[PDB]
Amino acid sequence: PTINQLVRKGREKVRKKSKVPALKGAPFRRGVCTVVRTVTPKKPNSALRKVAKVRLTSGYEVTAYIPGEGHNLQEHSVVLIRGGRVKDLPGVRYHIVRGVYDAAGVKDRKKSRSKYGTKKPKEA
Amino acid sequence: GRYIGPVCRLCRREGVKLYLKGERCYSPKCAMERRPYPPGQHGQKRARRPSDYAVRLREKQKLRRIYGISERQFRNLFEEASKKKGVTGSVFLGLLESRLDNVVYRLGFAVSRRQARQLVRHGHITVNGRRVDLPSYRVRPGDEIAVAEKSRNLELIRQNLEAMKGRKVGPWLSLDVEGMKGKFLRLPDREDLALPVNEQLVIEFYSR
Amino acid sequence: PKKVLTGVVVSDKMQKTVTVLVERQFPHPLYGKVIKRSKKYLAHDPEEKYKLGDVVEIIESRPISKRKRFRVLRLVESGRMDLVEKYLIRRQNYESLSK
Amino acid sequence: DFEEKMILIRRTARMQAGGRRFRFGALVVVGDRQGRVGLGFGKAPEVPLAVQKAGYYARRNMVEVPLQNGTIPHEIEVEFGASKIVLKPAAPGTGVIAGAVPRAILELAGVTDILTKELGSRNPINIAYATMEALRQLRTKADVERLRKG
Amino acid sequence: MVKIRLARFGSKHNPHYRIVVTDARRKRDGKYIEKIGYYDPRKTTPDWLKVDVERARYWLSVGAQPTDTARRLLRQAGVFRQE
Amino acid sequence: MLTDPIADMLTRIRNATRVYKESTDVPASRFKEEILRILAREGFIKGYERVDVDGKPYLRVYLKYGPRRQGPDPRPEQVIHHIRRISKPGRRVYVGVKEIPRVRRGLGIAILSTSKGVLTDREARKLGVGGELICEVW
RNA sequence: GGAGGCAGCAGUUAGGAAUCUUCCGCAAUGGGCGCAAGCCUGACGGAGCGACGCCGCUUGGAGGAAGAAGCCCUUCGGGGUGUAAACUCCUGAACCCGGGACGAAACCCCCGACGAGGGGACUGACGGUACCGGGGUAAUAGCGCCGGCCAACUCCGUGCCAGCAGCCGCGGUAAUACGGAGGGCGCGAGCGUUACCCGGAUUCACUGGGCGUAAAGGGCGUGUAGGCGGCCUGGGGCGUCCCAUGUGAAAGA
Numbered sequence A: 001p002t003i004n005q006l007v008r009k010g011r012e013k014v015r016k017k018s019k020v021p022a023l024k025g026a027p028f029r030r031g032v033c034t035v036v037r038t039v040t041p042k043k044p045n046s047a048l049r050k051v052a053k054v055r056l057t058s059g060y061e062v063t064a065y066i067p068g069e070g071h072n073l074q075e076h077s078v079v080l081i082r083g084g085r086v087k088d089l090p091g092v093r094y095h096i097v098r099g100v101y102d103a104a105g106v107k108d109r110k111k112s113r114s115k116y117g118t119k120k121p122k123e124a
Numbered sequence B: 001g002r003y004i005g006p007v008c009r010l011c012r013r014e015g016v017k018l019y020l021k022g023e024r025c026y027s028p029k030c031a032m033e034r035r036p037y038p039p040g041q042h043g044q045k046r047a048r049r050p051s052d053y054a055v056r057l058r059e060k061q062k063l064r065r066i067y068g069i070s071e072r073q074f075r076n077l078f079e080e081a082s083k084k085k086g087v088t089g090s091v092f093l094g095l096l097e098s099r100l101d102n103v104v105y106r107l108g109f110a111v112s113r114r115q116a117r118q119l120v121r122h123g124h125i126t127v128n129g130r131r132v133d134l135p136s137y138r139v140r141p142g143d144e145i146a147v148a149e150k151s152r153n154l155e156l157i158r159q160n161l162e163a164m165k166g167r168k169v170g171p172w173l174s175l176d177v178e179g180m181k182g183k184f185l186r187l188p189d190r191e192d193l194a195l196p197v198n199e200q201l202v203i204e205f206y207s208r
Numbered sequence C: 001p002k003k004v005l006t007g008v009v010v011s012d013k014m015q016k017t018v019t020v021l022v023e024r025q026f027p028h029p030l031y032g033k034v035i036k037r038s039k040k041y042l043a044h045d046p047e048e049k050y051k052l053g054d055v056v057e058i059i060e061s062r063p064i065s066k067r068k069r070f071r072v073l074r075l076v077e078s079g080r081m082d083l084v085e086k087y088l089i090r091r092q093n094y095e096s097l098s099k
Numbered sequence D: 001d002f003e004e005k006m007i008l009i010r011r012t013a014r015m016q017a018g019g020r021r022f023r024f025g026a027l028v029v030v031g032d033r034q035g036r037v038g039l040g041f042g043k044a045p046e047v048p049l050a051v052q053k054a055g056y057y058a059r060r061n062m063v064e065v066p067l068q069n070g071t072i073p074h075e076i077e078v079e080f081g082a083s084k085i086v087l088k089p090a091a092p093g094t095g096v097i098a099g100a101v102p103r104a105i106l107e108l109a110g111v112t113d114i115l116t117k118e119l120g121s122r123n124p125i126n127i128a129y130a131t132m133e134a135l136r137q138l139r140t141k142a143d144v145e146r147l148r149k150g
Numbered sequence E: 001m002v003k004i005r006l007a008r009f010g011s012k013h014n015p016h017y018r019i020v021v022t023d024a025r026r027k028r029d030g031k032y033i034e035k036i037g038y039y040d041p042r043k044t045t046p047d048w049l050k051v052d053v054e055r056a057r058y059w060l061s062v063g064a065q066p067t068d069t070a071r072r073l074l075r076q077a078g079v080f081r082q083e
Numbered sequence F: 001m002l003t004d005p006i007a008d009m010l011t012r013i014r015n016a017t018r019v020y021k022e023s024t025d026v027p028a029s030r031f032k033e034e035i036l037r038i039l040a041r042e043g044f045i046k047g048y049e050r051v052d053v054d055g056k057p058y059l060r061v062y063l064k065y066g067p068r069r070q071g072p073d074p075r076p077e078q079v080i081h082h083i084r085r086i087s088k089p090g091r092r093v094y095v096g097v098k099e100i101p102r103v104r105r106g107l108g109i110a111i112l113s114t115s116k117g118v119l120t121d122r123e124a125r126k127l128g129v130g131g132e133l134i135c136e137v138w
Numbered sequence G: 001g002g003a004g005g006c007a008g009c010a011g012u013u014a015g016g017a018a019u020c021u022u023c024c025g026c027a028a029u030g031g032g033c034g035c036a037a038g039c040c041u042g043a044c045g046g047a048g049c050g051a052c053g054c055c056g057c058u059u060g061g062a063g064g065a066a067g068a069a070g071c072c073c074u075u076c077g078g079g080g081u082g083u084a085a086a087c088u089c090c091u092g093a094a095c096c097c098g099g100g101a102c103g104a105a106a107c108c109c110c111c112g113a114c115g116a117g118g119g120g121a122c123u124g125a126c127g128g129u130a131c132c133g134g135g136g137u138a139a140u141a142g143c144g145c146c147g148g149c150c151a152a153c154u155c156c157g158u159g160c161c162a163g164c165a166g167c168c169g170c171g172g173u174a175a176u177a178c179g180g181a182g183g184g185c186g187c188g189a190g191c192g193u194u195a196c197c198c199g200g201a202u203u204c205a206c207u208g209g210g211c212g213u214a215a216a217g218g219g220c221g222u223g224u225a226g227g228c229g230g231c232c233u234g235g236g237g238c239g240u241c242c243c244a245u246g247u248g249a250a251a252g253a
């Protein structure tokens, strides 16, 4: 634009989009598993992926990935939702925080232990 | 902080002989002499040519390891140097070298910089007559750095000040072996320290 | 000091009041161009002495009504119906912006 | 005994009846760290000949860098294609503040302290070529006074 | 009324006051009319009580009351002695 | 009808220099001359002279170049590598003395209109005055 | 018929991913009342809890093998962990003993005049705390990452499963990308994660971008407001520039 145009109409400041109505802009959210179930990924990948539909304190029911080999979530398990999507399950915008509320840690886990909510194993 | 854990193992990896044990890292032993390759299952394999990052990471790490200083303390020390007047590289060394734990090593009251830390920290050092136990303490031009009167005749201190009869202490300093006193005269010039460290690459590390 | 402003009389439809239009110019805070904005001031004229086209110093004052906080200081020059016509064209053009 | 720094290796491909067919391209900077630098882009059916040729062409395309205590006489912005390099002298202690491509180029020229921005298209090649064009256009106070006399 | 009094600065276990003149109704640490001295009750430095006497006198003469504790400190720097 | 005669003058210089003209003509103004006075004084141009094309005042400006050069492309280097209007009718640029620019780190010149005349950055700074940033040259 | 209004300090309860003691003391500073003594002061000064944040400090130091064992790799000679340990000396966090603050000199009292000025008395929550002296024990280490960006690689298990994932994408039976081991890199009483802001983003571009074909010239005139306006001389001095001066509180920088 000419400077006069810029005077008259100016520049539109960007404005940008949450990936994550964990409402409020909370960093986490309590919810209850409504359904726990397995789903299949989008074309390139193939798996039986573990997700829970989750009804939230935030007023919203959404799906959420259950990370870790193995889990203990069932129909009313309480859960901490985390944010983070999965490039592979469409409309899974959130993860479940293992190690919190009714989400158990991941058993036998020994490497990336603090994700996966796993207590430091005893070196008896 | 001060790391705590195997040293003449980064006397290696940096691939260049720091002096973390003082006395042994002079014997046919600093492993630079024996095993001048990085630690671990690899180490003696084909060196892959370093990324521009690794070049600088290593240079930064080299310098830091030399003084036994936490990265948080180091970056701070560095950011202070940058704001300070004139050449950030040179100045930054001078600030590292102004440290009490290191001044004490440069005086040879202690063999290694680790040791100097432990001495300072245990009340054995005194600056201008009052006792200081803060390794990080900043030493200023004109300060008397002595050995505490009660500590004066300790096995380790006599050994160490016995070896200082003979030696020349770096030009920016004075030493009084008989009376166990030292004087920080001025800040170290960039050349007064023959450091195995291109400090200009360290500035560049912090530019990212 | 009491703020003095000068500008033209663009209305004298009121009793003992003239509407006085003040142009002013500032650099744009970001883009720097000198811009020209304008404000109208109701100005006390207790002796209905000022007429349309009069260019007048306006001076800050003890409130005289809601809106009126400026008396007419003096008459810089007279019959500038060109500046009056300008403002009225700007005003009449509004009739052609609605639905 | 110029130094040499290997800036870019890539493998291009072209097409033939039933086949992709490859070729390599190497961008190599060559320089003494004392005001002389070279850029060369070499291609060959295998990597080391490409690097080799690059080396050759660089030593054959070199430049007057007018250093001044490890920095540069004055600002320059060069556009090369849709790539842009901005170059700003700096006092000592600054370091060479630059992307990997123009860093290499400036280090081997013997630049110690300088500030830079890659703008526009970051394509390493056109950035390289523009860094070079920038330095090729630097002038010293002396170069300038000489140009204007009587 | 207006006051000559100690505004607390410094830090925890580090009292360092400013001798300041201020409406009585301000909060203690609030806005003040003018600074005149400073005071360090622990004399950690030799220049631990300072006062600008010629100003304190202006303020006393236009009806500022000093705090007991402030008075003591102006007295000590001879705001009150008159030869 | 020419919106910016100064700009047009600078542009006549740049256009001429890029084809290595001996000289060029620019319709005359006192202000234009004062700019040229400086270009000359700083050695970007050999100098100018008033003249009269078809009954009308121009300033014929005499361009200056470097030596002819070696290799493919022997075109002289420009003395005027760059000449750019700053202040312009659509956005006037004004700067006081303490924020006058240093152009190309000293090797360039800025030019401004001041209440003491048309000065360079160096003249102005040493006179203590700001003004309109007419243009920068290097 | 009455009573009530913690968005005062604490605290409860609910909501929440989540945020403290129903603490000590008016000794200080400040406030209200009083001639004063003094009363009141959840302002305040302190203590407590929380790695929430920042700064500082410790978990040893010097010696110690062509190099134990274990464990990992192995081309079955070795190689790695590693001077790391064991081991010898040395020092002595914590502890325990003794001593022990500054912060507090006024108000008041007496001489002087109930002024200035000189002299006297009381007063400490924090706190038996800080700190000083004397004894004195080798005394917590973990977290993330090692496909590229990005610093750091081998073996086993697995076989589009389990799983990883910020993007490219990894996983189909030799996977440096899954899981574990050893090894490494990076930080270190922390290390990661998620959320949000700026950066990178010259990707709203004043600095500092664009529209033939990438997104972008209005289908074309006419024209209102508006924006912009050739050459010369004078007056004004609004823009503009200069100087002085006031203001730009404190804190922060």
Ligand SMILES: [Mg+2]
Residues within 6 Å of the ligand: A112
């Ligand atoms: Mg992982």
Ligand SMILES: [Mg+2]
Residues within 6 Å of the ligand: D120, D121
């Ligand atoms: Mg781009």
Ligand SMILES: [Mg+2]
Residues within 6 Å of the ligand: none
């Ligand atoms: Mg709840």
Ligand SMILES: [Mg+2]
Residues within 6 Å of the ligand: G201
């Ligand atoms: Mg931006």
Ligand SMILES: [Mg+2]
Residues within 6 Å of the ligand: G209, G210
């Ligand atoms: Mg664009």
Ligand SMILES: [Mg+2]
Residues within 6 Å of the ligand: none
């Ligand atoms: Mg198309």
Ligand SMILES: [Mg+2]
Residues within 6 Å of the ligand: none
């Ligand atoms: Mg198009």
Ligand SMILES: [Mg+2]
Residues within 6 Å of the ligand: none
């Ligand atoms: Mg068209």
Ligand SMILES: [Mg+2]
Residues within 6 Å of the ligand: none
């Ligand atoms: Mg018009």
